[PDB]
Write a protein that binds this ligand. Sequence first.
Ligand code: MH0
Ligand code: MH0
Ligand SMILES: C[C@H](O)[C@H](O)[C@H]1CNc2nc(N)[nH]c(=O)c2N1
Ligand SMILES: C[C@H](O)[C@H](O)[C@H]1CNc2nc(N)[nH]c(=O)c2N1
Lengths: 405, 405
Amino acid sequence: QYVRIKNWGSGEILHDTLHHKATSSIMNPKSLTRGPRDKPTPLEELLPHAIEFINQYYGSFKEAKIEEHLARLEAVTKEIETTGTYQLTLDELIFATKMAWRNAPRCIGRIQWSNLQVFDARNCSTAQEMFQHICRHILYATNNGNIRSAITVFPQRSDGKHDFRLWNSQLIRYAGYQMPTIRGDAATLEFTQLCIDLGWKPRYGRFDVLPLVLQADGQDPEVFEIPPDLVLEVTMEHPKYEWFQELGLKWYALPAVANMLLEVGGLEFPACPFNGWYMGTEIGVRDFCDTQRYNILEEVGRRMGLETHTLASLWKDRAVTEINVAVLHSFQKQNVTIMDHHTASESFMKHMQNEYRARGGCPADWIWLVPPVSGSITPVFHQEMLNYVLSPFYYYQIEPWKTHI
Amino acid sequence: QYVRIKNWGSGEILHDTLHHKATSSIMNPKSLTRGPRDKPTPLEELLPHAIEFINQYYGSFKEAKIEEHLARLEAVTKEIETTGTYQLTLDELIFATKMAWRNAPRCIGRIQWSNLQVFDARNCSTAQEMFQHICRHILYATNNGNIRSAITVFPQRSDGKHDFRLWNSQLIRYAGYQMPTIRGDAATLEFTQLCIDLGWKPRYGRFDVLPLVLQADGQDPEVFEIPPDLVLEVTMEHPKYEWFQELGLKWYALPAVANMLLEVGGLEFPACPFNGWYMGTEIGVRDFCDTQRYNILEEVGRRMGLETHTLASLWKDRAVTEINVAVLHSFQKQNVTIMDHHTASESFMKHMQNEYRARGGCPADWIWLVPPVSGSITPVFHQEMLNYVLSPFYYYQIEPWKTHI
Ligand code: MH0
Ligand code: MH0
Ligand SMILES: C[C@H](O)[C@H](O)[C@H]1CNc2nc(N)[nH]c(=O)c2N1
Ligand SMILES: C[C@H](O)[C@H](O)[C@H]1CNc2nc(N)[nH]c(=O)c2N1
């Protein structure tokens, strides 16, 4: 069967068949969260999940590998009977990570899905070994500002009481402090409190990089400071407004999300931080202009000398645009990979067209793929989308501090 | 029971209970369309629909009217047994129209829901009487540019073969012609063809107001030209860019949608055109800047002397903003009611807060309530919403030319 979807700009029609392979405006709906266990994954659930994955994998090549396909089926089964689980071949993992990314309905850069570097840290055992792996990560991805997509996969959930887990929301992330006002990133107020509760030394700034809070093999969490030589940053200049530097703003160059779970073949890797690179509006519009974060918009408004007291003047529409201009300009001047949202949007549309011919669909969350400024000016606004959870997948998780033992 | 929803800006939480009273990114999903019948509405369906409505109605006052409530229950029933349907008291209709509007999940102006003027034309019998009613409408609403919300309700669907139906998508709407290119509003190309097929005289302009194509008591459709004295328009001036007038643009002042069905109390009024007033971005961003309509954006780009050949320059973000500035400025100069999207957004948020205390919910379609430019700058972006179909309701319908008999 299938579902007809229309792009209202080009008038083009597309038929979705891929949604049949799905599973069972809210930001964190339960359907997108994968929570804790306290007992291993039942064998009858696990086995056909594994068999299906192994078939996806061996079903991806141009030349079938029916011998090793058949061999890997038996091998995987025998392993599950004898050990109660299994381990993925390195190529399987690589394939899983790119696939899960391919299946991230809230991501706009998925034209890049087969261009990812994978770090196998499935043999990590302690917090300090995590912290070293994360440091290798931050350094590989950052590449002196020529950002590279990478993921570090840590040991899979086994029984569920030995979970490896980054407590951070992103690898680099500015601290936010309540004050004697709020200084820094107000979004990380509660998490900053947590770092302080665990002995981290607050420096009370607007751009103080938070510490990695790591938990290995179910252990209690240990606090690590990131070597500032590793954290690359971009100071904000506007290419015509000389006064923009006086706002004294910067942002980190590495958008690396830390707290999501990779589901694959019946397995769960609750620690698999990954990174892409920035799309300007994340910093320009969300980080700098959300009232709940930094909230510069009224100030850039006042310094442009606009009528910031009458909404019908569209001064907000003029301010934010220049801020976006600041960010894109500052990233290019200092050689840090970035993409403006117009370009990203056209890129995604190309991807979708490629994904529909290749496999008859592309899961997509309109509410996320449309930029937070200039919606209908981008082509993604006009494209109808179906949103569905396939496998593998990157799920959200419950905040570990609400469930630590 | 209930559902928890978060506003991520204020951090405020709201509990939705109203969704329990619901019924059974795609623009026209079937769940939002109410199509044709060929036999009357079965009595067993109709009766509890009517009883429920009558209870909603008599349940709305501060002082109960239990006698007339009870009386109206019997009266309505007796009428349905004897006549196979019923007729609403004028106050019932008024109440129904405002309620259905209150229940329009894709509308942003609903703080105005109890401020509507109702024209009872349920006794219309012929096309010419429709056309006169529509003319009274256009004239009342337009009010010399001080726009007033109004609706004209025509006779309810009875058997389903005598349906009253406006074939227009809106009352005022510019024509679009294929050319020896495309001139005018490309969105109304197919409908313009239809008007021409029925004898209307094409004038081949960019802003030629289309004719009302009316169908009464199931009859074939008759074509009427709207008296230009009734169609009020705003010519576009930019208050700093002298060259904006040379684009030679204007738009009509009356946004009046013609083709939706009012469902109420088991009844269907397939002809009930209504109007509000404009929110700038409809004209500024959609009508003028959608590639599929008018598509001025590259031209205003070139005349601003911006680098319209490099997307990372954000020239699209600068152009569109000024166009929005043109529209808002031209409507105010010429005394035509209009509202900018920042203001509308704050207005809706106030409404939602009022709707949740008053009746524990507000149906809402995020994908529609968020303006097509400057999403996260408006508060509506950050508010989680639940979208559900209540009753009464304004449904979409199937294009009548695909089903005319
Ligand atoms: C393999 C993992 C992965 C990689 C690599 C990846 C690479 C990239 N991404 Fe992107 N992307 C990935 C998976 C996601 C997820 C799962 C989400 C949504 C997560 C969430 O709920 O916050 C996401 N990406 C979300 C986003 C968002 C929006 C985030 C937000 O607004 O909060 C952007 C702009 C984005 N991406 C762009 C990009 C770009 C550009 C690249 C590089 C080409
Ligand atoms: C009682 C009927 C009704 C009235 C009166 C009404 C009055 C108003 N409205 Fe609004 N509104 C109504 C019911 C709707 C519907 C049913 C829709 C969506 C219809 C559709 O699918 O195209 C809608 N309104 C849609 C809209 C839209 C978006 C339309 C689009 O993008 O295509 C806007 C901007 C809007 N309104 C604003 C307003 C304003 C401002 C007022 C005046 C206060
Ligand atoms: C409430 C609403 O879902 C929320 O604000 C969403 C909107 N769409 C988004 N889209 C992206 N890319 N990132 C976000 O954080 C959000 N937030
Ligand atoms: C495909 C997508 O649903 C479509 O472009 C929608 C998006 N949201 C909208 N919102 C409004 N107000 N009006 C519209 O026409 C649309 N179109």
